[model samples]
Target chain A: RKDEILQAALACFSEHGVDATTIEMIRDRSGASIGSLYHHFGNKERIHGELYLAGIGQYAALLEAGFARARSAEETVRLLVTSYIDWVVANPDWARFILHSRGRVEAGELGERLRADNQAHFARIHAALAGYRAEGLFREMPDDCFASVVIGPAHDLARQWLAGRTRVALADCRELLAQVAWDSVRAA
Target chain B: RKDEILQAALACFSEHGVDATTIEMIRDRSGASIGSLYHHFGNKERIHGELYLAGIGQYAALLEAGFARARSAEETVRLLVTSYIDWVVANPDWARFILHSRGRVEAGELGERLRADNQAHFARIHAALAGYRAEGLFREMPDDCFASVVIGPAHDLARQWLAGRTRVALADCRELLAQVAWDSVRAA
Candidate 1:
């Protein structure tokens, strides 16, 4: 039944998007009664919310591990970006679901959580910056800006790449992305 | 009637997303008879399609002018980011609409058109990069990656800021953003 729900959801959600996906369609696809579906999910949106939370958990863990394994601050940033891109490619459905599910969720809750995670990510990132900042290799930029510089391109281009705009694959861009990414915080 | 339809569409689309926003709700809010709504827009999705195209067109024009007026390439990039943040704040409805709209539109003729327009926007961004690239002051990197490197941070941060995550205003991020943006491209 869980498998059935996931299969049905992956199909309908991908085609019609989250908001457009009706519980009836899930019932039809899963061969489960609507009562059973509701018993499990409580509501239609809850299904998507559950899937998103579960899937992103894996990514968050991957990023944490990647950050822990880096020998240098530069490697830490690169690995984090690469891991995210790898996750996105592997879970395009989840990506689409997230972007599509924006407003329906509690905006404040989502914003606060995302911001906290982002700030935490920056703190981890600052450990890498400590060496460079001390050497005065980079400018007198705040740590958050440094983070914005590194993570931003990897994100935007990865998104563009995933959305099928660029000819460059993540592999092709990784080295170049790392170079410029490091340039963002390099010691002068 | 057209104005009313657009208003209702905006309201419905944001609340329920484009897929959930039915013609009936649009009709109720818009006071457009079925025939009138259909006459103006062939279908509900088509209404969103038109609105999205128009919005991007206006945005591209605004960015081009902003870039042209800046005294330096660095300033041009900063203005580009700030102006985008300002636009997001000023037109929260459209900003939110376009945010989810791009992800949901997915593979289609209209999607292709939007991608093309988006590609043109990136090209114009690259045009600005050329001035810095010509100075031989910028690092040798794939132009797209460099563009992504510099602009991605501003783009992500802008979205975060607009979405109300970071307490820091757009004004606070601009100088550091500009410096990092230039660092990503400037000659090593």
Candidate 2:
């Protein structure tokens, strides 16, 4: 029941910009009573607060699982690129909210939580690639740039696709983007 | 005077986020009289409306000048990658607002004008690259992906730098990003 309401809120937010969205609107779309909504979340802001945290939690899990399978630096790039594109393709609306609405996330009441999660998330990647750097798989630039250099191209591709700027489907360019990401980062 | 007021609105928007900003704040920052501001823009919305159009105009001019300097396909990608990074480095706050806030542009009253301009902008890029495709400089993918393929990496680099996610500067990775862009798309 809670999960259904969450998705209903996502559909409402997706159709109507978050600003114009109200508790009643979410209730109307959710078919959940105002009483239950208030019982579950005191206000509309709390609904989106949960939305942001859950969406980011999903991403953290995705990266953790993907990183577990990646044995080499190049494999890490490919996994990140392919998994991101595939995941966004699988969950378009939720993916876009988290991807494009970082500013809102940072400015909201949950900003501290996001900041902590972000710092810890980066630390995980930094540690993962620190091993790669030790093995001489990366260039001499700052290792913190590992994720961006490896996944930046694919990130924008997904950005364009998610925003309806591109006619190409997100899944169509998976291999090409994975290759592009690996090409950008490998110690050639 | 109008330009100064425009930048004042930009700074206010940057500092306060666009939603929280009001006409009084812009007036306070610009030191412009309310009577004159009303005379020029009629309202705060009108001020930001002009801001969006002007920022987009700057981008069109930058691309026009950069494209004029490039004679080959690889040069086109290189020029685009460098030009985008350089322009953002030159105007960080204004650049960020324009880049990250396209949703507001499309949802606002000037949405029609933006749609028209967007259609024309993509057409211009398509025309510019049509000749390159004919000469076998690009791969066989839909040529519309040309811009993203060529500049996506640097675009994200600037995105990270402007958003303070990366410690390194946008200009630092210009050549590497250009090479990465070219390597991704050139006929191999």
Candidate 3:
């Protein structure tokens, strides 16, 4: 299965990182023939790009769902932080892979798509906060910075936790960080 | 000069990233011979590692200086955020290099030194905040997350600024984010 091969590829990617992982390992892990793997992916770089796209899709979809359900300025920031925490907590490997690896394909089409995705998300967030800032419920800043102020702390904690350095779990810090996030964006 | 070659290498590293950079580019940029480059640093990888170490040293020393001058929990966090902003503002290329290029040498000695340096800094921050939570001036949380909450937003801004994605400059956000950083950790 294409999906099965992809899953096997990510497993190796997660453990060995994308650069060190070879098609041979994926074939051995997935039990797919060498010819079949090439037939499906054409090359290892294609597989890497496909996996990155899939990871980004899952993460983007989760954030979009949270954004849709946001009710107030506080709730919006809370959802952003909690949604981020939940995603990293649920998928540490994918999160780390996404966090650490992007070098090879970053100058290619995938990088363009990634930038496009970020712009779209930034616009959605900007649109979401339009009324709040005008009404003086949200702090004044550049539109792109709103999400950064809201979720950066949780991201900090998540990074440390994934590296096995932090004493706290992302799930446990959900409310604490959601509160911290809201405080950063709220009007003084 | 070795320092001149390093500066040239960092300029290439800044423009082309670490993997895409070559000794020839450094030689061309600095007018240094290939023999001198190899004689001084052995290879491109060694040059990269030395640059990373130098970057980390500058960052670590600045943080230590800030930590030493902090008078309270609020000052500590404020200093952390402002110091980060000032450094990134002043040394955008170095900041980008240090932030982005860790993969090739990350499994080597430099990575170990990086982790050890982080632990030493973490200890200092933890020590600085030792009496604050007990006095109820700082909210109680994991030792690590405190720094994260205080500076992650600044880091977020810096990343965007380096990528040419943000309208706001890092210098302008210094006071704004220092307040936001202090707000995140202050006792309720």
Candidate 4:
């Protein structure tokens, strides 16, 4: 029931931006009463906060799972790239929500929790990359720079695909993109 | 007078979003009367439309100028990546406006003009890349995918910087990012 309400809230938020989406609208679409909605979430902002954080959490989990099975640094890079693409394609609404809420997510109680969550997840990503750099398998660059090289192309393509601007389907271009990702960050 | 009005409108839109901002607010911010605001833009949507399209045109012009003096295909890629970062950093308001207006930019007369302008500018970028590929300087990937390869990392970092997520200043990361970009798309 909680998941159902969240799904309905996501659809509403995606179509109608945050300010325009109302709690009643969420209730009507979600088939949950006002009382029940309040029982699960104190307010609309809480709903948005939970959805945004959950999406990032899921994305981080995918990264951890994908990284754990790596046989080589190259394989790890490939998995990271492909998993990111797969995750975005599968959960575009959540992806869009997370993308759009970058700076706006840094206020109030939820903001503190989300910021801490991001730091914890990013630390995992950094440790993985730092280990690879120690092995001389990746360049000695900042994590953000390495992330940009590894996932930047896929991220742009995903944004285009989400916005209905891509000339080719994103799924079709995944393998080629994965190759580009690997080539961009591998140590010389 | 028109530029002043548009500047005021951009700031309002950046802070309050397209739907929340009103002509009255723009008039007050610009110190222009309501009649004068309408005289310049005719309506709120028109103001939004013109600002959005003009921002895109300026961005396209930056790309064209950056590509013109490239001594080699590698330089061309670097210039393109660095110029993009420079432009966005220099024009945060306009950059944020354009980024936020992605899906919403596809509605009326302005949408049609913006779409046409994008295609025309992208054609030039495509032609430039095609020339590089013809000389075996770039990989034989589709233009959009190649664009992602060359510009994706820079674009992502630019976005992170804009969102206040980057720990290091983006200006300092330019040269390193350009090298990563060049490595990604340059042929073997």
Candidate 5:
């Protein structure tokens, strides 16, 4: 029943977006009463708080695990990029809440926690990139700059894919984007 | 009254988004009678159709004029990259609308007209790029590859800016992305 309510809340939030959705709307969709919603979440914002943490937590974990397992810097970067795209495609509504409503959510305690988690995930990539740079495999650039150039196209293509205009499957774009990103920074 | 109604419609569409907005909703927001709206636009979609045409027409004209004066294939490509970023920052609302809804508006007569107009715009860019390829300045890849690689990051930066999270200025990104695109296909 809790899972059902969570799914319904996600759908309501996804379809109506974060600002437009209310507790009553979630309750109506989730088949939960006002009392039960409060019992579970305490408030409307808590729902978003919990959701953000879950989403960002998973991403942080993916990055950490992908980074820890890579045999090479290129493979590490590829895993990071591919995993990110795969997650977005699989969780379009959830991803929209993460990507689209981030600004709305980015000022409170919850926002700080989410930001910290996101930065950690980014740091994981930078750590692996440092290895490659030390070996003279990547062009000497700041880690932040390298990360942006690497994931930049993934972000664009993910948006298009979520919006349903571009025909490139997120899976297919994984290596293709990796190739572009790797070539952009790899030593010539 | 007509102008006021259109302004109100744009405001509502900007904030509430297209899918959630309605004709009665427009009447309520604009204080314009249904009859007046019909007299001006025939319907709400017509209003959006006008908006679509207005936004794309401005960009199409700018691109054509920019490309027309360029001295070489590289110059033409440079203009497209710079001008696209320029358009996004200048017309933020239209940029958001097109970013979020370009795929939504594709179908039927409207879709066909938009596709044709869009293709014609790109056809010019492609023609200029063909000049480069003829001189063996670009890779002998499939035709759309150059267009995709060149314009892709500019579009990404626009989206980031629209979402209010961009770190780099639109103008600053111009030279870097242009160099990469130029390098991607250029032969020694």
Candidate 6:
């Protein structure tokens, strides 16, 4: 019943967005009474929060898994770029949900928890990056800002692709993008 | 009355977002009657569209003015990054509105118009880049991909600032970011 309601809410959100998807619509689609819906989820914001967090958790897991198999800093960076695009391609709806829900998430109770989780995942990336910087493979910059250099273009391209600004699938350009990302960060 | 309604709508949209703000709220804030609001603006979407276009025009004008005073390729890139942040800093509400309004604007009638305006501005930037590339100052890449390499990090940084993810003013990091941007695109 919980999964059913969650799925219904996700579909409504994926289609109508967060604000337009109402509790009533979720209730109608899930066939849950108002009392049952409230009992299970409490409110619409909670449902959105749960889904957004779950999506981020899933993405973080992918990053960890990708890093575990990486042989070199360059390869790790490549994995980061490709895996990010792969995750988005594999979960376009969730990608859309997370992207669209940014302002609302920051404004809601999930903000702090989300930031902690984000930092936790990013710490692992930074740890790997430090070795590269010491070896003079990556440019000297604040660790926090490094991800922007390595992943910024890919993120922008992914975003544009997701928003239908580009005609091709992001995966098609993944290799080229990975190279661009690698070049952007490599020490002169 | 139209300008008043637009100003009110911008404030309401900035504070409450598009879906949450209603015509009634706009009318009340603008001190225009419901009938008068409709007579002047037609609807909330129209008001949003007008503001979005105006904001883009304003931003584009700043870019042009900045570029005219630029001395070199690096300076031009710096101007692009700094001017963008300057405009966003100067117009937080409008910046917030534009950043948050992407999905709506893309779905609405303004998408094509927005693309055209963006491409026209990009053409000027590309022309400058072509000369740099000829002089072996910039790397060989597709014209469309240049902005991602040059300004993607700054855009990401500006976005984080605007979204309150970072406490530091985006303007403060303009030089560091511009150098990073220039390095990312400069000949290897």
On a 0 to 1 TM-score scale, where does candidate 4 land against the true structure?
0.87
* Shift of residue A94 alpha carbon in model 3, Å: 0.7
Residue A44, candidate 3: Cα error in Å is 2.5
Q: What's the lDDT for all of these models?
A: 0.70, 0.78, 0.79, 0.83, 0.70, 0.77
Worst 10 residues of 6 chain B by lDDT: B140-149
Task: Tell me how far the alpha carbon of residue A169 in candidate 4 is from the true structure, in angstroms, after superposition.
Answer: 1.7
TM-score, first chain, each model: 0.71, 0.88, 0.86, 0.90, 0.84, 0.86
As for candidate 4, its clashing pairs are none
* lDDT string, candidate 6, B29-133, tens digits: 999998897787678887788778778788778877877788988887777777777788788888878877766776798778878887897677767667777
* Tens-digit lDDT string for candidate 5 (B94-161): 87777655544674337877877777876776676676778877555544434555566677666766
Give the residue spans of candidate 4 off by over 4 A.
A11-36, A101-109, B11-36
Instruction: Summing lDDT over every window of 10 consecutive residues in candidate 2 chain A, give the lowest-scoring window.
Output: A138-147
CA deviation > 4 Å runs, candidate 3: A1-5, A24-42, B1-5, B20-42
Candidate 3 colliding pairs: none
Better candidate by lDDT, 2 or 4: 4
Higher-scoring candidate on TM-score, 1 or 3: 3
**C-alpha RMSD values across all candidates:** 5.7, 2.9, 2.9, 2.9, 6.1, 4.4
The model with the greatest DockQ is 4
Best by lDDT, which number?
Answer: 4
For candidate 2, write residues B1-188 as lDDT tens digits.
77888999999999998889999998899999889899877678778877887787777777788777787888877776777777787889988888877877788887888888888777877777778889998766755455666767677777778878888767777777777678778886
Looking at model 1, residue B48 earns an lDDT score of 81
Docking class of 2: acceptable
- Two-way TM-score contest, 2 vs 6, winner: 2
- After superposition, candidate 1 runs with Cα above 4 Å error: A1-47, A89-96, A102-147, B1-47, B66-76, B103-116, B119-123, B126-137
Every model's DockQ, to 2 decimals? 0.56, 0.48, 0.61, 0.71, 0.20, 0.37
Candidate 6, residue A145: Cα displacement in angstroms equals 2.4
User: How high is the lDDT of residue A106 in model 5?
Assistant: 72
Give the higher-TM-score candidate: 1 or 4: 4
Query: Across residues A46-156, which tens digit of lDDT does each residue of candidate 2 receive?
Result: 788778777777766788898988877888868777777777888899988887777777788888988898898778777667777888776556543555666676777
